[PDB]
Design a protein around this ligand. Sequence first.
Ligand SMILES: CC(C)(C)OC(=O)N1CCN(c2cc(-c3ccccc3O)nnc2N)CC1
Length: 110
Amino acid sequence: MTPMQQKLNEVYEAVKNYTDKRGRRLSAIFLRLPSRSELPDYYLTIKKPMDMEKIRSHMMANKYQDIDSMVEDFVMMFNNACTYNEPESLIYKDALVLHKVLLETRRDLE
Ligand SMILES: CC(C)(C)OC(=O)N1CCN(c2cc(-c3ccccc3O)nnc2N)CC1
């Protein structure tokens, strides 16, 4: 695997694997967004749906030319979560924390 592919897998795994101070894996809610059949209202609040399974499949299909492209999908996903849920909710706070982890991970790989 190229250094580019190694950095992509590392960024993805940092987000996926992060746990909080009590061991809770924050990424669990962001793996699979329910379909529009199951969750119509989300697809009207949210222009471009995104979840980690989609990011993972783009990564296995090498569709990421650089790291910036992967971060954009992650930031899109976390912005989506912070649009659909209110700031006081757990999912909003989990999105904010994983967003910070994402950027700190990209920075550490600079
Ligand atoms: C019972 C039924 C009505 C089907 O609802 C559910 O099963 N839900 C579970 C998922 N849930 C949410 C997912 C995301 C989310 C997921 C992946 C990526 C980004 C995201 O924002 N965000 N906010 C939510 N609150 C919506 C409600």
